[PDB]
Amino acid sequence: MKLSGVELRRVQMPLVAPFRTSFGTASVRELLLLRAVTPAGEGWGECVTIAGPLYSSEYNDGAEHVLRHYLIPALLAAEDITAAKVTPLLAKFKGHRMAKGALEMAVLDAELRAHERSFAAELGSVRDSVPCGVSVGIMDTIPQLLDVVGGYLDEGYVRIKLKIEPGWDVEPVRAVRERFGDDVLLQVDANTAYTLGDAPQLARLDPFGLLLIEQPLEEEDVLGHAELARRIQTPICLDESIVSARAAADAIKLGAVQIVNIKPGRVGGYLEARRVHDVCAAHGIPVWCGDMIETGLGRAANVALASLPNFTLPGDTSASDRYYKTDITEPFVLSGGHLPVPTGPGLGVAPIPELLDEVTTAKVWIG
Amino acid sequence: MKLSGVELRRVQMPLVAPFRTSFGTASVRELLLLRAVTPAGEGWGECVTIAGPLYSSEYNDGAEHVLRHYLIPALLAAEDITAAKVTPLLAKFKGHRMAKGALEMAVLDAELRAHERSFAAELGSVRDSVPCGVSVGIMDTIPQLLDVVGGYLDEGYVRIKLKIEPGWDVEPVRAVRERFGDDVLLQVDANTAYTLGDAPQLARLDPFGLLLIEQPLEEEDVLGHAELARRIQTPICLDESIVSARAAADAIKLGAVQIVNIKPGRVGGYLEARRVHDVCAAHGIPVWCGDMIETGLGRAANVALASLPNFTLPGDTSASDRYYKTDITEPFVLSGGHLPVPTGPGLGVAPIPELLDEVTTAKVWIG
Amino acid sequence: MKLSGVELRRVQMPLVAPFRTSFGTASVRELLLLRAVTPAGEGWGECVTIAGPLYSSEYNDGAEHVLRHYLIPALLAAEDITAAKVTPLLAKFKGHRMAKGALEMAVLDAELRAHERSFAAELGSVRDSVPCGVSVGIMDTIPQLLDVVGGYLDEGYVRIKLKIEPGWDVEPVRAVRERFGDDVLLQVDANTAYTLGDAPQLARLDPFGLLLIEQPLEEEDVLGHAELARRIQTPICLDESIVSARAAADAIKLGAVQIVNIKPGRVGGYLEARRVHDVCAAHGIPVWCGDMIETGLGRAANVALASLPNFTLPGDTSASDRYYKTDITEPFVLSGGHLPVPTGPGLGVAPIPELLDEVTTAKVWIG
Amino acid sequence: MKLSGVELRRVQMPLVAPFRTSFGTASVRELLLLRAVTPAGEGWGECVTIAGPLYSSEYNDGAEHVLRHYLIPALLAAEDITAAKVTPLLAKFKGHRMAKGALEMAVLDAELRAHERSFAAELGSVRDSVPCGVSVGIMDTIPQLLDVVGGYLDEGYVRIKLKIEPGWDVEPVRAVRERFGDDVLLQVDANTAYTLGDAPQLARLDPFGLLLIEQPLEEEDVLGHAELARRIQTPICLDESIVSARAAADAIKLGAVQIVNIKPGRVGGYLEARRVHDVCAAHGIPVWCGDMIETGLGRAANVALASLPNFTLPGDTSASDRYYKTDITEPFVLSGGHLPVPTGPGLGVAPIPELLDEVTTAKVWIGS
Ligand SMILES: CC(=O)N[C@@H](Cc1ccc2ccccc2c1)C(=O)O
Ligand SMILES: CC(=O)N[C@@H](Cc1ccc2ccccc2c1)C(=O)O
Ligand SMILES: CC(=O)N[C@@H](Cc1ccc2ccccc2c1)C(=O)O
Ligand SMILES: CC(=O)N[C@@H](Cc1ccc2ccccc2c1)C(=O)O
Ligand SMILES: [Mg+2]
Ligand SMILES: [Mg+2]
Numbered sequence A, B, C: 001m002k003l004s005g006v007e008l009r010r011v012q013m014p015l016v017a018p019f020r021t022s023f024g025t026a027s028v029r030e031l032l033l034l035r036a037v038t039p040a041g042e043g044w045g046e047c048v049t050i051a052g053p054l055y056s057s058e059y060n061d062g063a064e065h066v067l068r069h070y071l072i073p074a075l076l077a078a079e080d081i082t083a084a085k086v087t088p089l090l091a092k093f094k095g096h097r098m099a100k101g102a103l104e105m106a107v108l109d110a111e112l113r114a115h116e117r118s119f120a121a122e123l124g125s126v127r128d129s130v131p132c133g134v135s136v137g138i139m140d141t142i143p144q145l146l147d148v149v150g151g152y153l154d155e156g157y158v159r160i161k162l163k164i165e166p167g168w169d170v171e172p173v174r175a176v177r178e179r180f181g182d183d184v185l186l187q188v189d190a191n192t193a194y195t196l197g198d199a200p201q202l203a204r205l206d207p208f209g210l211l212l213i214e215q216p217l218e219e220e221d222v223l224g225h226a227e228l229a230r231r232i233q234t235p236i237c238l239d240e241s242i243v244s245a246r247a248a249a250d251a252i253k254l255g256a257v258q259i260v261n262i263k264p265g266r267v268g269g270y271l272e273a274r275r276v277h278d279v280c281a282a283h284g285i286p287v288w289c290g291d292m293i294e295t296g297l298g299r300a301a302n303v304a305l306a307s308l309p310n311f312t313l314p315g316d317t318s319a320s321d322r323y324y325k326t327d328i329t330e331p332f333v334l335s336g337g338h339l340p341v342p343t344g345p346g347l348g349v350a351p352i353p354e355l356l357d358e359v360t361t362a363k364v365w366i367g
Numbered sequence D: 001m002k003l004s005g006v007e008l009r010r011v012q013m014p015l016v017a018p019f020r021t022s023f024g025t026a027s028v029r030e031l032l033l034l035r036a037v038t039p040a041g042e043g044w045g046e047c048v049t050i051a052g053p054l055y056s057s058e059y060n061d062g063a064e065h066v067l068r069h070y071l072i073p074a075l076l077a078a079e080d081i082t083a084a085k086v087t088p089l090l091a092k093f094k095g096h097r098m099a100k101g102a103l104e105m106a107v108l109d110a111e112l113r114a115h116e117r118s119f120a121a122e123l124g125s126v127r128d129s130v131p132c133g134v135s136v137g138i139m140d141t142i143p144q145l146l147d148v149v150g151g152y153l154d155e156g157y158v159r160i161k162l163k164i165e166p167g168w169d170v171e172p173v174r175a176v177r178e179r180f181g182d183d184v185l186l187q188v189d190a191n192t193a194y195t196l197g198d199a200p201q202l203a204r205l206d207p208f209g210l211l212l213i214e215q216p217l218e219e220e221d222v223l224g225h226a227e228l229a230r231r232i233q234t235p236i237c238l239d240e241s242i243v244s245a246r247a248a249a250d251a252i253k254l255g256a257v258q259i260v261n262i263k264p265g266r267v268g269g270y271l272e273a274r275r276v277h278d279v280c281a282a283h284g285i286p287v288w289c290g291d292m293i294e295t296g297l298g299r300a301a302n303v304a305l306a307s308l309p310n311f312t313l314p315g316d317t318s319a320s321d322r323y324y325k326t327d328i329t330e331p332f333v334l335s336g337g338h339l340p341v342p343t344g345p346g347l348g349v350a351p352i353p354e355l356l357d358e359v360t361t362a363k364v365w366i367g368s
């Protein structure tokens, strides 16, 4: 229908523990939420930008700005709107993928609710539940790490992903392997921390049988990744580099990636994410669902996406309580190492308005 | 859902004119129809198989057979069913793609009718109408062809496609080009009638500025097509060879194709066809909508498909009256060279059930 | 001569043991036989299609149908016929290779009987006997398989091939290698059960010195096999993929295969199988004779084929009693690990009619 | 079956006109015939070697010598002979392909006569007649060439092949094209007379639309031929270089050849030639049947072979009278540009004994 307006909210949520990555430590999660309003009713979008431009060039205040002043006005000016039409209507604006994706999610959730159709149904789900791995930060000490991993294993997460960076790579892997053995599904994630000159150091990870090293080098260095793959045994996985289905196709032709992490906001929305799934499937490349420490709306959408057929490695969509004591929707609870795929219309979750209000820091209408 | 069963009907409809291709002439179009019945209501699929195994290894009685004894049962035995789920349920059965596609189409029309959503919406349409070309058969004499062509250009069709075979290639193209000039969008299609040995002959098309030559060699000879592309100026388009998204990705990697003809039945479904579109888009390969001389059901499904964003060349989805004096649904009518995209739920068209019956041959209930 | 007509029989013979493959369990062997009739005399052909389309798109009922309504008629309409001329006379029909091969086999046995020549002599045999291995199905438990294999070695079979599937690969192999040691010629066969995503699992085969792994991926994924070959140590062998001498040439050019399994019916006849053998020999690629659990008619022909110079690995053509209590011809009996090559005219073997009668289920005469 | 022995004949037949190639002129055809004698009957083989080692390293006296002292004893020492087993029985002897193929032809003719089967049926024939071209020698003057080509065209040959060499390439092809037009199937053959340094001279053939240039470079220069193909428009055809099916696979893989000339003697026999035909067809490479100015025997086997499905270009198997006033078998006569495929058992022809006797200069029996 014609979109009436969009309500944009700043939202802040404490983390159960600080989460430390190669680019820093956050203790809180700030995020934007969008609520699209149509004659038909309503839809929810979550943006995955972080507070400052440390993971990619996009950040909360920048997403909000491009949202208020470009993206939202362009959709409000359109005659008939459809999730699929969002992309062409926003095409003239370069980049701003996470902001575009957030807004596409909200249009999609509104549309789908109006057709009593789930996200899972629209995306092409073949599974009622998905297996879930867990992502683990850099720690101050090896023993703090072992106890943390140990804990996650006990609750039955199927795979352990370790954040790494120079000075924290080989040792923490060695120690996790000595304590928990060669059978645990183990992978590493640099968030762009190394260079091609670090190859011999990343080769010292060969003896530990990791599933993948995720984004060892910078976002723009795709040829460098192909070069690095000729020198290390650990399969390369790309995250920040995979900004679109075309980018996935390019990386695969160039021998720069054997496994692709998918994050919907990173590629510009759930529709593009599906295309990425499909392009990868066609080239025989396994995909998995990435996590941006989303609240329950984004987690719901990701759980759905993650049940597509080519998702053949456990994703990062951990249960609500891996990050939050109190989520803003009905929480996701781990159950035999798995999470259930949401069932109702659209996302199949909405925010509980008392909980959302506690953690809303600002609210603006754009109409 | 749970499927109740499927009415499998043999139909047969006369053509305005006999249609001559490199593999034969048919004067009449015979097909299967499937009416799937669920609790949520009912959907129509059309099968694209022809009478004998002359285009591919699949044909009417053979589809009908694999459908009755293999496919339709495996769906009837299923706990829950979605369009998406058809593929993995039918996966143990090798081949029979056109059959599987007719079935998925029927399930899909059911599903979408049950959510008041169009084919256009589910597939990701960005456009209300598609530009339309026509396919012109082999004729007895050059002047008989030059009239037929004259005619369709008069009706406002935007591109001409000519069936070609050894004996009927350079002369028809030279004549069409002498009669109608260089601005006409012109291409040829061989339905596998040449070998690599005929490259010098095909290179004789070089001066007529054709958009493409569609399937010059056999279905299996992907590498042969990449070889051929080194020897002739006319871009290669593939049809019979493009059996899946994976086969499209293979052919593009090998340099065997520059432009892909999409036929949803050939690739085993409208959902797979969507994947072929996205794989091609990600490699910068233009696609166009192919035609198996379907009724208004398949035509409705194809025009919806053809309105996807990477369909950037004119399809073969011609007006209903190009093939049939009367169609089994509301007819499609050319209007400034375009066909308009169906609006209502599912296909947005349904068999006028008096009209179906004048042209039906057999009926069987599987249940 | 001119062909008078063909007798088609459906036949059904119990198996000595159920045979389990990644696509299912066989307890009984259902097949078509063909008796071609000429003024001269008559010949026997065997179809290798199985009950339903789980190995390829071809099955018992669809072979029979394409035979009666397309293949056999086109030969009866023919003036002069030779085995060599079958191919161009059936060329207008796509696919149905197993059906075409059954028919060419019958024509060939008639033609050769009338010149008093063995299949061996026609095909180019250079050996009087051939070494034989055995194919061993998926077992319920490791000890059971260890007993079955133990039995087959004791009878003096020269090589063991184990069927494998996700769940049944590294353990069986490890087990077989523990009880019987590193000198036994051992290899595996997946019948398409893996994707390229399972490369790490398949590389877990590396230490066991397998001669080859047969068809790890789907029939159509030729490039996927070359990708997989860069990732594992075990040589790749193709079966389902090798449908022609041309498909074998392509797969060799792409690096997709290192050893080729030849099955006459899969490739559309003994004459095409001879071409496959010569194409691989010219490229230095070893071939070996595959088995389709044929009656002794097929087995006689396979044994003749397997005696060509480039069959330098042991074939799957086991003794009649590895599958059948009671063959329909004088049985093949293993002797110093070899089968002897048949000597008389044609197959050098014919159905014993009392026996052929107990196991016949239907009969039809095409004239 | 044991081979009983082989009668070896030297034969000399005059040519109707002297035949000139980049390696010389022949006005007489000297050749070897073999009559293999088995308990099941007789067969005829023809050796394609020429008098001296100017086309390849094999020649009539070398072929006779290797036959008497190596090839024939190995087959006579054998326990079982079939045509297929000839190859492994002789595999220890390196080279001598023309000599081996002559012996294989005779053995195969004997085996096929005994089963009452034609060469055509054993090879896989799919046609009853085959279109024929003519090979035209180097002449002293253009007008002599144009008269000769003019004559073969009136007789109905469907394709002209011109022998060429440095000094006789662009001009004859220019003339032939001016006199007879752009429609005539026209091709050239150098018999190794060029080097890669001559690529600019050979690119001067680009405007004339030739079907192919046959063997512009030496036998061993497979890489040089792939380089030459990057420089000229005329498709490359190989002849001397194609010595086996494997050599054909190799040249194709290297981009050295677009079209293959098959000569059965050159590849070591009709069975190997069937194999070259199959390898080429699997790669999309058209083949055509070559001619070594055989008598009716080799001509009969070549017409049979030329009727295989991948021979999609006209061969050099001209009518008997293009070379010989009197053939030693029933002669081959052109008819609507075609030759008919022989029909009876074996070759389908046999020497007329009085004619063979007029033309035999020596005969020796080689037995156990
Ligand atoms: C889920 C995971 O382990 N890492 C994400 C990115 C990430 C990293 C740091 C974050 C800090 C604040 C909010 C979101 C964040 C997301 C990744 O795959 O790289
Ligand atoms: C639309 C077009 O020009 N032809 C189809 C082939 C085709 C398809 C189905 C047919 C059914 C009956 C008779 C002829 C047919 C030809 C194609 O693109 O190859
Ligand atoms: C000899 C070997 O191991 N099997 C064949 C395939 C095969 C498999 C299962 C069958 C079941 C019923 C009838 C025929 C069958 C043929 C193969 O190599 O793939
Ligand atoms: C038929 C054709 O034009 N020439 C053959 C070879 C050839 C050339 C010269 C010869 C002289 C005497 C006897 C046999 C010969 C054969 C060729 O293609 O090269
Ligand atoms: Mg990451
Ligand atoms: Mg087409």
Ligand SMILES: [Mg+2]
Residues within 6 Å of the ligand: C189, C191, C214, C215, C239, C240
């Ligand atoms: Mg197999």
Ligand SMILES: [Mg+2]
Residues within 6 Å of the ligand: D189, D191, D214, D215, D239, D240, D261
């Ligand atoms: Mg030559």
